[PDB]
Amino acid sequence: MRVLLIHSDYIEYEVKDKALKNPEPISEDMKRGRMEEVLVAFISVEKVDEKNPEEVSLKAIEEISKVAEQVKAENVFVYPFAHLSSELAKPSVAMDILNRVYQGLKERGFNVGKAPFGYYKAFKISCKGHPLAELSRTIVPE
Amino acid sequence: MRVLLIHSDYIEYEVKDKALKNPEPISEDMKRGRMEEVLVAFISVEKVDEKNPEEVSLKAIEEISKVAEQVKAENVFVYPFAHLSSELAKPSVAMDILNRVYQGLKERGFNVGKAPFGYYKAFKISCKGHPLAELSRTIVPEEARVE
Ligand SMILES: C[C@@H](O)[C@H](N)C(=O)NS(=O)(=O)OC[C@H]1O[C@@H](n2cnc3c(N)ncnc32)[C@H](O)[C@@H]1O
Ligand SMILES: C[C@@H](O)[C@H](N)C(=O)NS(=O)(=O)OC[C@H]1O[C@@H](n2cnc3c(N)ncnc32)[C@H](O)[C@@H]1O
């Protein structure tokens, strides 16, 4: 798993065309999204993560949380992102691991949002200036 | 070299604190920037690129130019980014590569922009979201530098 964390003033998206023959189904409400004062997590689920979804998710959960806590972020946004790696996990596996991360962050008490999986999305983001507002991590099954 | 291309409505940044001890010197104007209808190139210069700076730059200038054409981008922005790779090039090599790509892009006729190297920066961006507004590329040297 390749993660990119951006502490942002906001994250906003708008669903466009599908990027997969059969993307995640979504209601009208889910077509647009917006969060403010949020740590945005751009995540690429990798092929090697297929070996241990749980371990990967748990560790990913822990890292996002630590950072979310370090920068004083109460809102976290999970953003399916396929461009932080070239060894991508198949869709169904990535979606599952992404959901587990989302659930685990919700479990920790964070106000958590997510963007629909499998669609091209126009999006707006504003990274804060500070030293910890732009971090990257690599979580993989040991 | 790892490159993340974002065709966006605009890009804007503002320098904050310094990320490196000896960061690139800058003028007053280089502190803030804003460019419209631009293909933004976030680039992580890697260790393997040190093997042949000129070659890797030409290969990156080529790819970036190609994508700019596919989306009809008249504006291009070179954004120094250290998070697309875990095996980064030294500060000087990266600065030389980035400068070469920035310059190569100007020569290809594009209106080019850039954000200062080695500085934490706040930035805003707006991906257009069409099929080719989010793309990534991996560029590396094949031959060894001769000089
Ligand atoms: C390869 C292209 O022709 C194809 N349209 C494509 O984009 N596939 S993809 O791997 O980029 O994935 C498309 C979208 O499905 C979701 N997706 C698929 N695989 C992953 C993954 N491994 N990690 C995160 N998101 C993924 C994301 O929304 C991603 O943007
Ligand atoms: C030194 C750390 O505390 C700091 N977080 C850091 O990331 N430094 S760094 O070496 O990754 O690079 C900091 C900044 O210098 C520039 N930079 C340094 N190395 C590279 C590189 N290999 N490719 C692109 N930019 C780089 C970029 O502006 C990058 O954001």
Distance CA B42, CA B23 (A): 18
Chain A residues touching B83 at Cβ < 8 A: 4, 134-136
- B44 alpha carbon – ligand 2 mean position (Å): 8
Q: Is A126 in Cβ contact with B16 (below 8 Å)?
A: no
Ligand nearest to the CA of A42: 1
- Alpha-carbon span B147 to B145, nearest angstrom: 7
* Other CB atoms within 10 A of residue B24 CB: 17
CA of B120 relative to ligand 2 center, distance in Å: 9
Judge whether B4 and B81 are in contact, CB under 8 Å: yes
CB contact under 8 A, A122 and B122: no
Ligand with the closest atom to the CA of A1: 1
| CA pair distance A103, A110, nearest whole angstrom | 10
- Name residue A69's amino acid: E
Beta bridge partners of B22: none
Which residues of chain A lie closer than 8 angstroms to B17, CB-CB?
A: 129-131
A58, A94, B5, B41, B109 from B2: Cα distances, Å: 28, 22, 10, 10, 23
**C-alpha–C-alpha distance, residues B60 and B50, integer Å:** 14
Residue A76 CA to residue A68 CA, distance in Å, equals 7
All domains in chain B, ordered by first residue: 1-139 (3.50.80.10)
Beta bridge partners of A114: A78
**Ordered DSSP codes for chain B:** -EEEEEEEEEEEEEEEEESSSSPPP--SGGGEEEEEEEEEEEEE-BGGGGG-HHHHHHHHHHHHHHHHHHTT-SEEEEEE-SSS-SSBPPHHHHHHHHHHHHHHHHHTT-EEEE--TTEEEEEEEEE--STTSEEEEE----SPP--
Can you tell me which residue has the tokens 């966006």? B8
| Chain A to chain B Cβ contacts (< 8 Å) | 67
* Pair B108, B41: CB distance under 8 Å: no
Furthest-apart CA pair in chain B: how many Å?
43
Chain A residues 14-53 within an 8 A CB cutoff of chain B: 14, 16-17, 19
Task: State which residue of chain B sits closest to A4, comparing Cα positions.
Answer: B83
The torsion angles phi and psi of B49, rounded to 5 degrees, stand at -70, -20
- C-alpha B11/C-alpha B36 separation (Å) is 7
* Cβ burial B89-106 (10 Å sphere, 16+ → b, else e): bebebbbbbbbbbbebbe
Q: How far is A88 from chain B (nearest CA, A)?
A: 13
DSSP string, chain A: -EEEEEEEEEEEEEEEEESSSS-----GGGGEEEEEEEEEEEEE-BGGGGG-HHHHHHHHHHHHHHHHHHTT-SEEEEEE-SSS-SSBPPHHHHHHHHHHHHHHHHHTT-EEEE--TTEEEEEEEEE-SSTTSEEEEE----
CB contact (8 A) between residue A121 and residue B129: yes
Q: Taking Cα atoms as reference points, which of B140, B40, B18 lies closest to residue B89?
A: B140
Measured in angstroms, the resolution is 2.3
Minimal Cα distance from A20: which residue of B?
Answer: B131
